[PDB]
């Protein structure tokens, strides 16, 4: 139980192909084991009263990978959205829907959708690209102020805390406008090895930040 | 100096921790910035020595100018001295920031187009991420368009965040946090960051 909680947590559920290779599995076979961890993060966030969580699903650049991996991460993303849809969330999917790569299955979540009891915002980046996001604005806006509040991800507010699994300390183009001031916590374990303590340590790190220091 | 297997093309530096450094030494909060000038030179010297192509220094942002006036003068004066000390060396200097302000130092106006064209050192001075992206009014028209993708961003003072540095160029950057405050810069801080980078 925390004095200070982030309003909005970003999750980069990385390490799936490494986890699978380490386990004696094929690379493409780790993604199926990323679905459960997502559901557990959702569970703990609801439980402590986190307002909003954004999951990084897959990028436009991720779809340049072997088809056996694209099929596998895409299916795992589809199923995570469908499963949170079975819970008590306000669900939103953001991504380039003007592409055959965007899964039909997720179109119905491209406007925020209340399921069960609601009262937690869950976002998924699906066929997302930072360049697509920033320039969604540049195309046919009156000015700079309008351009920025009309990025593709404009419905997603500033990220307070970004937690990335798989031990890499990088944003991989997740929400460059919303992450300018995000505190970044790296978990060395791969996403399918998610444990609650990963999120609890990320929340202790956020609480432990010195609020006198400014942006 | 270690022999490096691979090096980044472009290092970003966030020289943070100056105020905590001064407080820990019983000095005034604003009295740590001037102890950040020589560390800048040490980084420059190591980067030329090992042949890094480009370094961008976070100097100060528009958000930083909300700080007390006594802090603002100390960090602005230290940024001006750091640009001047690098300008004496064999470096192509570029300053990026909002010059349409009383805050922008007239001394640095001559670096707002890259000098000695033909190591590249960039400084962000009265820089703002919102100001940068809105400058066009795309990749090539933002205020910082001359500054390419950052490969490795190294931040002193223990905080793991960009504080609005170059949102476009940092999207894929590998980030290395030194817990020590910037005035406590040691050569091994930069070497451990390069060992991190080559291990990715
Ligand atoms: C610019 C090269 C070195 C300059 C010497 C240090 C004095 C100016 C640097 C101020 C750094 C401010 C970084 C603050 C980051 C943040 O906003 O959290």
Give the structure's gist in a few sentences:
The first copy, chain A, is of the alpha/beta class and 215 residues long. Helices cover 31% and strands 18% of the residues of chain A.
Structure explained in plain terms:
Chain A is of the alpha/beta class and about 220 residues long. Chain A has a single domain (about 10-210), classed as Decaprenyl diphosphate synthase-like (Undecaprenyl pyrophosphate synthetase, 3-Layer(aba) Sandwich), CATH 3.40.1180. Chain A contains six helices and seven strands. Chain A has helices spanning about 15-20, 35-50, 65-85, 130-140, 145-150, 195-205; strands spanning about 10, 50-60, 90-95, 115, 120-130, 160-165, 185. Chain A has a seven-stranded mixed beta sheet with strand order 4-3-5-2-1-6-7, sandwiched between helices. In chain A, helix 2 packs parallel to helix 3 (about 65-85). Chain A is globular. In chain A, about 45% of the residues are buried. At the A-B interface, helix 4, helix 5 and strand 7 of A face helix 4 and strand 6 of B. Palmitic acid binds near residues 33, 36, 40, 79 and 123 of chain B.
How does the SSE layout of this entry go?
The structure is a homodimer.
Chain A: E1 8-12, H1 16-22, H2 35-48, E2 52-59, H3 67-85, E3 90-94, E4 113-114, E5 121-128, H4 130-138, H5 144-149, E6 161-165, E7 183-187, H6 196-207
Parallel strand pairs in A: 1-2, 1-6, 2-5, 3-5, 6-7
Antiparallel strand pairs in A: 3-4
Helix pairs in contact in A: 2-3
Bound molecules: palmitic acid (PLM).
């Amino acid at each position: 139980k925390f004095k200070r909680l982030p309003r909005h947590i970003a999750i980069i559920p990385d390490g799936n192909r490494r986890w699978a290779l380490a386990r004696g599995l094929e690379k493409h076979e780790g993604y199926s084991s990323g679905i459960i961890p997502g559901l557990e993060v959702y569970d703990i966030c609801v439980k402590i009263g986190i307002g909003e969580v954004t999951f990084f699903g897959f990028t436009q650049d991720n779809t340049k990978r072997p088809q056996i991996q694209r099929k596998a991460f895409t299916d795992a993303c589809i199923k995570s959205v469908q499963e949170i849809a079975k819970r008590d969330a306000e669900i939103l999917v953001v991504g380039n829907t003007n592409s055959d790569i965007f899964p039909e299955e997720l179109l119905e979540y491209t406007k925020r959708t209340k399921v069960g009891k609601g009262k937690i915002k869950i976002n998924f980046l699906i066929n997302y690209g930072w360049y697509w996001d920033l320039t969604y604005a540049y195309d046919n806006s009156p000015d700079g102020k309008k351009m920025i509040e009309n990025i593709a991800s404009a419905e997603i507010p500033r990220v307070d805390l970004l937690i990335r699994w798989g031990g890499r300390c990088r944003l991989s183009g997740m929400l460059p406008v919303q992450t300018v001031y995000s505190d970044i916590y790296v978990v060395d374990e791969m996403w399918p090895d998610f444990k609650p303590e990963h999120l609890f340590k990320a929340l202790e790190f956020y609480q432990n930040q010195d609020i006198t220091l400014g942006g």
